[PDB]
Symmetry: C3
Subunit: 53 residues, 3 copies
Amino acid sequence: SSNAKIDQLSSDVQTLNAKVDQASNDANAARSDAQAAKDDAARANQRLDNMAT
Amino acid sequence: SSNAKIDQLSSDVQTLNAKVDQASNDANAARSDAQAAKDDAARANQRLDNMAT
Amino acid sequence: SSNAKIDQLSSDVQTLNAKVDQASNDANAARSDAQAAKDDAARANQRLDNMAT
């Protein structure tokens, strides 16, 4: 049914919106965590580099 | 065409579902990897902190 | 309205496509950054491991 199909698509879209917003949250969180870790690892390696002296 | 437009939207939705599920996989993987790296960098810095003594 | 609802869904889909592509970019970037950080932290810990000797 045309109306039935439109209604199913409306629900599908809402479900996708929720999934999409959640994927972004996870991605932004990951972007953040990765940035912090990359900096902290860079810091540990700098400290090691200065160890010879 | 109404039916034609509905059919195109149905296909678009399916494509988005696949893209959405893939973005979540990448995000969750990244969240995991970042957590592990942040911990490992934190560990390296702790070991360095204890180096003075 | 059937046509009105179809038009709203078309716009919703386009918005989701943009959000979906952006979430993937963030996720892939995060995957990359996390990989680099995990390697750099692993490197710092290896260097520390060799410190005893």
